[PDB]
Nucleic acid binder design. Structure first.
Length: 137
DNA sequence: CCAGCGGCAGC
DNA sequence: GCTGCGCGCTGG
């Protein structure tokens, strides 16, 4: 299973090989415009390239990086918690993990696994992709 | 100028 | 279902 490249340009299309990066991408996109989030996502992934490093991060430092995005302290605490569980808990679907809900589960089930047919997403840029999947099928 | 709008936990 | 978190994008 390889999710196809779409005319919609979801960030999920580039990060599916590393689930952690793709899931962090969804967290950056919680009620935050893609325009601001994605640039700042790359900035994060240079300072914190893995779940192994983010897990030892000081949430307060992670928060200074997020300031322009909003929900900066909430999401910072979230990035240090999720990354910890991601490597420490046994999980099948990321929904089990702190900070990941329907949206992040929907992205993982489409891009990181062959389960797109079984998914009913709600997030806007995601339904455009998912419908495009059924349409081009 | 300006106000509406781009998920999650925890109760 | 309800509520707090939060900035800047956009478009009249």
């Amino acid at each position: 299973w390889t999710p196809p490249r779409s005319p919609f340009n979801l960030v999920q299309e580039t990060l599916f090989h590393d689930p952690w990066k793709l899931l962090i991408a969804t967290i950056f996109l919680n009620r935050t415009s893609g325009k601001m989030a994605i640039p700042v996502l790359w900035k994060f992934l240079e300072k914190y390239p893995s779940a192994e490093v983010a897990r030892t991060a000081d949430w307060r430092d992670v928060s200074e990086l997020l300031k322009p995005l909003g929900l900066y302290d909430l999401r910072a605490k979230t990035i240090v918690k999720f990354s910890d569980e991601y490597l420490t808990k046994q999980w099948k679907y990321p929904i089990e993990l702190h900070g990941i809900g329907k949206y992040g589960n929907d992205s993982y089930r489409i891009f990181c696994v062959n389960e797109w047919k079984q998914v009913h997403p709600e997030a806007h840029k995601l339904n455009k992709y998912h419908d495009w999947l059924w349409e081009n099928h």
